[PDB]
DNA sequence: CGTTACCGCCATCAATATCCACCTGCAGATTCTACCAAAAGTGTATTTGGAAACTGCTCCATCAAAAGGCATGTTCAGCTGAATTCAGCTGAACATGCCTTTTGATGGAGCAGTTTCCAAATACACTTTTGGTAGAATCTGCAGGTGGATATTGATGGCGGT
DNA sequence: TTACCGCCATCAATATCCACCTGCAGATTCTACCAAAAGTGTATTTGGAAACTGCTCCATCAAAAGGCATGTTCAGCTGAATTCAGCTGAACATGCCTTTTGATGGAGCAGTTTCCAAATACACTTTTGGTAGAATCTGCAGGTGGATATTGATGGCGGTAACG
């Protein structure tokens, strides 16, 4: 109702008006002819102001508060887009937006909603289907098909064959997909799906809001698709026990139990690239392929009675039945984290309790050497989790290296790790003299360097120099095979690429606590359904 | 190719020497004139101001500010520090007795 | 961008905020200060305001007594000296 | 002995008016006398300077009123000005 | 037979302050209402300072005003403290004031 | 042996002296020092007892004020112990030094 | 008259401590006392001379408390209770 | 167009004895005038208060000599007293 | 025949000093030698401050005394600074001074 | 024990702006003449303020004693001041955009110069009231000692978690 | 399964608050005399209120410009955390000298009288300092060539550690 919304919505407009005299240009309709160039209507398709807001709130054109919020945010967007950034008008618009945020949340929270911020997703880079190794940077023209397939500028001339001509819509990378709304069957109110954690599989009967549930004095059905119900593995059990023991001895008031599960484990083989294959494999100096076992892990916590995923893992394990030098080795391919862990202060240490806990595990199996690549992702790049929160600072190489060194010092204090070093010191430790003596891991930086340099006894000194440039980035850990865990086939998360694709398709993002919980429950449902099929 | 950049403090000391070797006014004329006019109309409306009175009041103002800022520098150094923070101003004005 | 009148039409910055950030920076640097906290300036601004009613009001009290509505520099000098802040050069 | 002028009795009546049952000690009474005298030379010098500024050879109630506003802070200044104005009006009304 | 002190409704002496103003060589001429204004101002100041001193004495369960009460009254009033900021009181002491960090920091 | 922690007796006697107004300097050494300084300025000089008392009380008040300033300046430096730089800075800001 | 010497030490360590405590000082370093003495001396050097400077101006040889009030007032240290 | 008295040509004249080949600016000259006026006012006020304290109705060279000794620092005061005494002796013998 | 300043060997005007003393309402009577003595004191102070200002100007490679030179002369003299400790110089600035802790290394 | 490659320190060089003097037009400083009300110097009568001369007299300097509220010297450990490390981050240095600031020109609101003249200020001689104040008598708030109920500090019994 | 640091609980050794009671210097009440004020009453003088008006210069407004306001990246800052040699506070024994009450010689402050050099008040004559207009001179503020001076970047050489 028009009058119903007024008593709450008017104070925000009053606060906006109170900003004097920054809000003065926005009080009256902006006339393109009055102030100069008439291109205001050409750039801004739909002009509006604060007087229009007052008229709408008086007559009652607004039906829901979301329309009012959308109109205010569209006003802000128009002001930002038309006026230049360095102009004082942009600064006044930003100040008014900040004032609007610092009061809108409680006001519409009193109306039953969760928050009053127009949330737009992060500028995440898209991948390419053709090259499989090309990404589209920001402010770059790309070509999209049904918002599902992406091709870059270079891949347009690389494809052979057009397979209509004017059937793909020309678009730009400024589009931000809006959040989806779900409507309660009993009430009829539509509201964002993420804050209510409603999925079509767990509750196929329909969506019931909290108000209707409390009206009938009945609670929502229990969710059997939780992280604790996932199959237990020996490595997962070990990590879970380690984290639980650490949190128990810490005895933090805000600490909660953490569940670690291994949802994928499969045997794979890495094949030597053509250059090294021609130089060494044909001569018989080294085998063509190296077999290994890849194991994928996640870490979960129970926050507000909801499972939340906060840590990821991808490792490659070359056992004792693997040809040297990869024999009895573990390599950390990719790792990712979400900083919504509670408590925050223990969070970092908890991460160590995983990595160290992993190093204590394989050491008992027979693995002697670990290999870590301290390469933080670039801007917009996501390793495992989708759309990291904007306030999540990406560690710099120096900070990341210090973090790696710190956990390794803690582990050595715990006697688990014999020692750790950079790769060049290891090369001296075994007197490396040929490229074959260096471990060969899938997706590793060194195989690509070897291929490029062969395309560029020169190999030994060349590779030693490349060790010298980026020795601090790579960590080789000396600790000093039958794996008790069985093979767990999981095509969904086998490789970070399929998981990222699924997250992009279903908008399973981690930009906020509610969004992260929605994503975690979505992956829980997906993992519980993939094992059945 | 990472162009030349002075370390923090060298330019500061250099311009400190420059401003200590010079005597020109630092506060811009028009904003100070507006401040004086507004605070005068706070006490009495429709006042008129002589240019000499305005410049004398301004010069007294930069003198008072430079004195209090020197005292503030001494206070910041007193606590084994190099950066000034509000409690330095508070201590300076307290010892001066104005507060 | 937006055109129209601008000269003296955008006094928008508050009265005491008329003094620019680099102005207070320069005043502090002349006092030998080499590093300034971010929120110092406004506080000094407030301090500046205080000094004003230490002198100007008194000078006003002089000007109203001489049956004048225009303040003179000699009034300002007397107001300054009466607080123990004697200023030379404007006694003519 | 030469007479030493003091404001003992007048401040005594003031104390009786503000506190009929409260006395004053000799030392504190001397403090009161010194305070009132100090106010006296301060206000007299301010009035003389005000006369000197305008080349005025006569000090009247207006000059002393301006000097009071210069010296007395705020509420004390307004209340003293009002009391003095009432006293001057009463004096000139007879 | 009416004195100028009673004529102005004042307790302080108009004639005495007039004579002191004349003797102080402050100006060649003194107005007729000038001693009346001085008497009124001095009486007002004395009135409020004595009232505050009596309040301080009552707060200390004392019926006689002492210089300690005078110091307590003067320093507890911001306007009087500003008026007497460069005057030291005899046998008045200082206000009880201990800084925060000086207190125990358990 | 019963012993109070360092500061409790200090606070006790600080409150005691803040509740009292009696002079803390004995009259005779101060009078002797005043006589020495005056003799260095002018020999064969005589002193009224009231003049000596006024000198002593004014000096005590001035020391009390500078000690207030010194204490608050030491509080500024995150310390509870005064060291002569506090007094030097207080006197400099007061204008007695620079 | 006898030439008195070395009586700045008459301002004993407990006396300087008491004056500091009346100032609210909680802890006193060992080198405070003598320093204050010098400052104390300076203050006397500031006042006594001026008071002494009054004495011959009246053609007198005895310092009165009224000249003391004069000197303290002229040095911005106005004092009450001893006249003036 | 009233005549505004100032020590200007005198101080400049003094400059001729101390720096024949050095000039002075107008702002610095007003600084000089204000300095001389302030020193004169301080000396006159101190002489007046010394005269008043002693019940002395006449201000002589002794009173302002005492005023200079009070206000002016040590060797500056000694030099000023010496030159004042020399000037008074020269005037008397003139 | 001869001006009082000339008779007293002084450059400042004795008569003007006497007139200002008379008009200042400082005292009902003014002695004859008081203006001479005060003019002598003022002349000494002016001469010595001018000497110091000229020395500062010469050290600054300048032949005209500016307020900066006056400030340098006054602040570099301890007793002149003490006399003018509560006096502000127009267009004079402050002495070059950097504290030890603020200095590098 | 031998060899090589990394890390640290020192030698050496590209580049920026902060200096330096040189040079030239010029607002501003200096030199000289003329006019002249305003002071400044001289003369003479008048008044008076403070110097000298003696002496009354208050308090200033100086010596006696004694015993006890504090000054002086010593100990120890409680803990605050001082030194070291390092990580979050707030400021420093800098390129980018353009805008508020600065300079010059132009109406009249009042700042000042002139003139009349009257309410209002000295000047002074009596005359009356009244504030300092010698002196004796009665009243009274609190200095000071006593006793015990009421806060303030500290770590003693034992329970407990790191 | 023995020692150690916090905490909330009681408890013992102490300083604090305070009511109570007694001697007494100090605060308050009269009697009286009083020279210094207070004040009314005329004469004289002049400070400035009042009215009219010329001259400043202050507010307002035009364009040309030398600045200021934001965002980025990062070397250095500040403060939290830790540890510790050391000192200044609490306690105590010893005694130094204080603290006041007392008296006394006399140098020196101050009251009283006399009276002359000096200050004052005109009255007059004279130089003279402040201002206005002309004109010559000039110290130093923008540019500008120039040597030079500082400083952070980079490469090279030596110390050192580690593997064989």
DSSP A20: T
Q: Calculate the CA A469 to chain-centre distance.
A: 30
* Contact call for residues H35 and I75 (beta carbons, < 8 A): no
G79 touches chain E (CB under 8 A): yes
What's the CA angle centered on I88, arms I82 and I89, to 5 degrees?
A: 105
Q: The dihedral of CA I16, I18, I23, I24: what is its sign? A: positive
Give the count of alpha carbons within 13 A of A433, CB side only. Answer: 2
Identify the residue whose Cα has the smallest distance to the C1' of J162: A249
Q: Which domain holds residue A11?
A: 2-120
Task: Supply I15's token pair.
Answer: 């008569």
End-to-end CA distance of chain I: 71
CA separation for the pair A36, A247 (Å, rounded): 65
What topology is assigned to F1-98 in CATH? Answer: Histone, subunit A (1.10.20)
Scanning every strand, the nucleotide with its C1' closest to I1's CA turns out to be: J41
Task: Supply A221's token pair.
Answer: 């059905």
Q: Which residue of B64, B78, B96 is the best one to mutate when testing the F interface, meaning the one whose CB has the most F CBs within 10 A?
A: B78
Bridge partners for A478 per DSSP: A369, A419
- Pairwise CB contact (< 8 Å): H53 & G53: no
I62 CA from J29 C1′ (Å): 15
Distance (Å) from the alpha carbon of D11 to chain E's nearest alpha carbon: 7
What's the CA angle centered on A241, arms A237 and A245, to 5 degrees?
A: 175
H near B: at least 3 beta-carbon pairs less than 8 Å apart: no
Protein-proximal positions, strand K, CB < 7 A: 13-16, 19, 26-28, 36-40, 46-49, 57-59, 62-64, 67-71, 75-79, 87-92, 97-100, 107-111, 118-120, 128-132, 139-140, 151-154, 162-164
Distance (Å) from the alpha carbon of I7 to chain E's nearest alpha carbon: 31
Domain boundaries, chain C: 2-90
B2 CA from J12 C1′ (Å): 20
Q: Which residue of F has its CA nearest to I86?
A: F95
DSSP A21: T
User: Which residue ranges form the domains of chain E, and what is each CATH number?
Assistant: 1-105 (1.10.20.10)
Burial of A415 (0-12, 13-18, 19+ CB in 10 A): exposed
* Contact call for residues G35 and G42 (beta carbons, < 8 A): no
Residues of chain F contacting I, Cβ within 8 Å = 95, 98
Scanning every strand, the nucleotide with its C1' closest to G11's CA turns out to be: J71
Domain boundaries, chain D: 8-92
User: What is the residue-wise DSSP string for B41-93?
Assistant: HHHSSS-EE-HHHHHHHHHHHHHHHHHHHHHHHHHHHHTT-SEE-HHHHHHHH
The answer to the question of whether A335 is labelled as a binding residue is: yes
Elucidation technique: cryo-EM
Interfacial I residues in 6-65 facing D (CB < 8 Å): 24-25
G30 touches chain F (CB under 8 A): no
Domain B2-99 grouped into CATH 2.60.40.1190: no
Q: The dihedral of CA A417, A419, A420, A423: what is its sign? A: negative
CATH architecture of the domain covering C2-90: Orthogonal Bundle (1.10)
F near E: at least 3 beta-carbon pairs less than 8 Å apart: yes
The CATH code that applies to domain D8-92 is 1.10.20.10
| Cβ atoms within 10 Å, residue A500 | 19
Superfamily covering domain H8-93 = Histone, subunit A (1.10.20.10)
- Which residues in chain C are immediately followed by a break of C to N over 2.5 Å? none
**Does a cis peptide bond (omega within 30 degrees of 0) precede residue A21?**
yes
- Pairwise CB contact (< 8 Å): B75 & F85: no
Identify the residue whose Cα has the smallest distance to the C1' of J127: E1
Helices G13-22 and G32-57, interaxial angle, to 10°? 90
Contacts of A497 (CB under 8 A, 6+ apart): A127
- Among candidates A352, A249, A378, which has minimal Cα distance to A299? A352
* Contact call for residues F15 and E96 (beta carbons, < 8 A): yes
Q: The dihedral of CA A135, A137, A138, A140: what is its sign? A: negative
CATH code: domain of residue A42: 1.20.920.10
* Contact call for residues A473 and A397 (beta carbons, < 8 A): yes
Question: φ and ψ at A180, to 5 degrees?
Answer: -85, 150
Q: Which residue of D has its CA nearest to G82?
A: D30
- Pairwise CB contact (< 8 Å): B84 & C49: no
| Cβ atoms within 10 Å, residue B1 | 2
Contacts of F40 (CB under 8 A, 6+ apart): none
| Cβ atoms within 10 Å, residue A249 | 8
- Closest by Cβ to B60, choosing from I67, I88, I92: I88
Domain boundaries, chain B: 2-99
Q: Which residue of D has its CA nearest to C65?
A: D66
* Contact call for residues A296 and A322 (beta carbons, < 8 A): no
> Is C28 strand, coil or helix?
helix
- Among candidates H73, H13, H76, H19, which has minimal Cα distance to I55? H19
Burial of A32 (0-12, 13-18, 19+ CB in 10 A): middle
The CATH code that applies to domain G1-82 is 1.10.20.10
Pairing verdict, β A149-151 and A143-145 = antiparallel
CA separation for the pair G2, F84 (Å, rounded): 34
* C-alpha pair distances (Å), G42 with each of D80, F62, G30, G48: 40, 12, 20, 10
I16 CA from K107 C1′ (Å): 45
Long-range residue pairs from A321-327, CB within 8 A, at least 24 positions apart, any chain: A321/A291, A321/A481, A322/A290, A322/A291, A322/A292, A323/A286, A323/A287, A323/A290, A325/A436, A325/A437, A325/A438, A325/A439, A325/A440, A326/A290, A326/A292, A326/A439, A326/A440, A326/A441
Distance (Å) from the alpha carbon of F52 to chain E's nearest alpha carbon: 14
Question: φ and ψ at F67, to 5 degrees?
Answer: -75, -35
I85 touches chain B (CB under 8 A): no
Task: Supply F22's token pair.
Answer: 């009696």
Identify the residue whose Cα has the smallest distance to the C1' of K63: C7
User: What is the residue-wise DSSP string for I2-54?
Assistant: --HHHHTT-SS-HHHHHHHHHHTTS-SEE-SHHHHHHHHHHHHHHHHHHHHHH
List of chain C residues whose C-beta atoms are within 8 Å of the C-beta of residue I86: 84-86
- Among candidates I42, I68, I40, which has minimal Cα distance to I56? I68
List of chain E residues whose C-beta atoms are within 8 Å of the C-beta of residue H48: 25
List of chain E residues whose C-beta atoms are within 8 Å of the C-beta of residue D23: 63-65
The answer to the question of whether A399 is labelled as a binding residue is: yes
- Pairwise CB contact (< 8 Å): H48 & E24: no
List of chain G residues whose C-beta atoms are within 8 Å of the C-beta of residue E70: none
Task: Give one word for A224, left, alpha or beta, with left for phi > 0 and alpha for psi -120 to 50.
Answer: alpha
CA separation for the pair F58, A161 (Å, rounded): 104
The answer to the question of whether A347 is labelled as a binding residue is: yes
- Pairwise CB contact (< 8 Å): D83 & E43: yes
Bridge partners for A331 per DSSP: A316, A371
Distance (Å) from the alpha carbon of H91 to chain G's nearest alpha carbon: 23
- Among candidates A480, A528, A203, which has minimal Cα distance to A367? A480
List of chain I residues whose C-beta atoms are within 8 Å of the C-beta of residue C88: 87-90
Distance (Å) from the alpha carbon of I89 to chain C's nearest alpha carbon: 6
- Among candidates A83, A56, A85, which has minimal Cα distance to A68? A56
Q: Calculate the CA A323 to chain-centre distance.
A: 35
């Amino acid at each position: 109702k028009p009058e119903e919304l007024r008593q709450a919505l008017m104070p925000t407009l009053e606060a906006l008006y109170r900003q004097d005299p920054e809000s003065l240009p926005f009080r009256q309709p902006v006339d393109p002819q009055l102030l100069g160039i008439p291109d205001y209507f050409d750039i801004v398709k739909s002009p509006m102001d604060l007087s229009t807001i007052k008229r709408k709130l008086d007559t009652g054109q607004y039906q829901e508060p979301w329309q009012y919020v959308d109109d205010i945010w569209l006003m802000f967007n128009n002001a930002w887009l038309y006026n230049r950034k360095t102009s004082r008008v942009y600064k006044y618009c930003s100040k008014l937006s900040e004032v609007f945020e610092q009061e809108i949340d409680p006001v519409m929270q009193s109306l039953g909603y969760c928050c009053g911020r127009k949330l737009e997703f992060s500028p995440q880079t898209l991948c390419c289907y053709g090259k499989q190794l090309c990404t589209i940077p920001r402010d770059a023209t790309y070509y999209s098909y049904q918002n599902r397939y992406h091709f870059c500028e270079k891949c347009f001339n690389e494809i052979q064959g057009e397979s209509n001509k004017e059937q793909f819509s020309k678009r730009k990378n400024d589009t931000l997909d809006p959040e989806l709304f779900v409507e309660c069957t009993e009430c009829g109110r539509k509201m964002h799906q993420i804050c209510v954690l409603h999925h079509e599989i767990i509750w196929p009967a329909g969506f019931v809001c909290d108000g209707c549930l409390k009206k009938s004095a009945r609670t929502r059905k229990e969710n059997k698709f939780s992280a604790k119900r996932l199959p237990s593995t020996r490595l997962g059990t070990f990590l879970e026990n380690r984290v639980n023991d650490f949190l128990r001895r810490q005895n933090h008031p805000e600490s909660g139990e953490v569940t670690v599960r291994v949802v994928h484990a499969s045997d794979k083989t890495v094949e030597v690239k053509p250059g090294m294959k021609a130089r060494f494999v044909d001569s018989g100096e080294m085998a063509e392929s190296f077999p290994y076992r890849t194991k994928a892990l996640f870490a979960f916590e129970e926050i507000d009675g909801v499972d939340l995923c906060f840590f990821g893992m991808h490792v490659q394990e070359y056992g004792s039945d693997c040809p040297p030098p990869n024999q009895r080795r573990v390599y950390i391919s990719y790792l990712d984290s979400v900083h919504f862990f509670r408590p925050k202060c223990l969070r970092t240490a908890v991460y160590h309790e995983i990595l160290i806990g992993y190093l204590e595990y394989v050491k008992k199996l027979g693995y002697t050497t670990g290999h870590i690549w301290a390469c933080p992702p670039s801007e917009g790049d996501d390793y495992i989790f989708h759309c990291h929160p904007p306030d999540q600072k990406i560690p710099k190489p120096k900070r990341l290296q210090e973090w790696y060194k710190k956990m390794l010092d803690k582990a050595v204090s715990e006697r688990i790790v014999h020692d750790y070093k950079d790769i060049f010191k290891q090369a001296t430790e075994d007197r490396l003299t040929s490229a074959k003596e260096l471990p060969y891991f899938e997706g590793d930086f060194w195989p690509n360097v070897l291929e490029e340099s062969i395309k560029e006894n020169d190999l030994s000194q060349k590779l030693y120099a490349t060790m010298e440039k980026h020795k601090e980035v790579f960590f080789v850990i000396r600790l000093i095979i039958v794996d008790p865990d069985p093979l767990i086939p999981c095509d969904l998360m086998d490789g970070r690429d399929a998981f990222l694709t699924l997250a992009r398709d279903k908008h399973l993002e981690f930009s906020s606590l509610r969004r992260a919980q929605w994503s975690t429950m979505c992956m829980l449902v997906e993992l519980h359904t993939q094992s059945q099929d | 190719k990472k162009p030349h950049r002075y370390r923090p403090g060298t330019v500061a000391l250099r311009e400190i020497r420059r401003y200590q070797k010079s005597t020109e006014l630092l506060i811009r004329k028009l904003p100070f004139q507006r401040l004086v006019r507004e605070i005068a109309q706070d006490f009495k409306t429709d006042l008129r101001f002589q240019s000499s009175a305005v410049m004398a009041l301004q010069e007294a103002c930069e003198a008072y500010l430079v004195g209090l800022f020197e005292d503030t520098n001494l206070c910041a150094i007193h606590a084994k520090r190099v950066t000034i923070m509000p409690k330095d101003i508070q201590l300076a004005r307290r010892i001066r007795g104005e507060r | 961008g937006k055109g129209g009148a601008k000269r003296h039409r955008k006094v928008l910055r508050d009265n005491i905020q008329g003094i620019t950030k680099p102005a207070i920076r320069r005043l502090a640097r002349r006092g030998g200060v080499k590093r300034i906290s971010g929120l110092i300036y406004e506080e000094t601004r407030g301090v500046l305001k205080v000094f004003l009613e230490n002198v100007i009001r008194d000078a006003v009290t002089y000007t109203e007594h001489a049956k004048r509505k225009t303040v003179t520099a000699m009034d300002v000098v007397y107001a300054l000296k009466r607080q123990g802040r004697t200023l030379y050069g404007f006694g003519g | 002995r030469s007479r030493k002028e003091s404001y003992s009795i007048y401040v005594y009546k003031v104390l009786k008016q503000v506190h009929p049952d409260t006395g004053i000690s000799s030392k504190a009474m001397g403090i009161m006398n010194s305070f009132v005298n100090d106010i006296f030379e301060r206000i007299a010098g301010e009035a003389s300077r005000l006369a000197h500024y305008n080349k005025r050879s006569t000090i009247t109630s207006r000059e002393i009123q301006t000097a009071v506003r210069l010296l007395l802070p705020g509420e004390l200044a307004k209340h003293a000005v009002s009391e003095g104005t009432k006293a001057v009006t009463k004096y000139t009304s007879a | 037979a009416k004195t100028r002190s009673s004529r102005a409704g004042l307790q302080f002496p108009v004639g005495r302050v007039h004579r002191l103003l004349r003797k102080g060589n402050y100006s060649e001429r003194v107005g007729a209402g000038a001693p009346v204004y001085l008497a009124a101002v001095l009486e007002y100041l004395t009135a409020e300072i004595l009232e505050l001193a009596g309040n301080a004495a009552r707060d200390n369960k004392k019926t006689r005003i002492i210089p300690r009460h005078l110091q307590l009254a003067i320093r507890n009033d911001e306007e009087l403290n500003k008026l007497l900021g460069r005057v030291t009181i005899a046998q008045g002491g200082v206000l009880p004031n201990i800084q925060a960090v000086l207190l125990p920091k358990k």
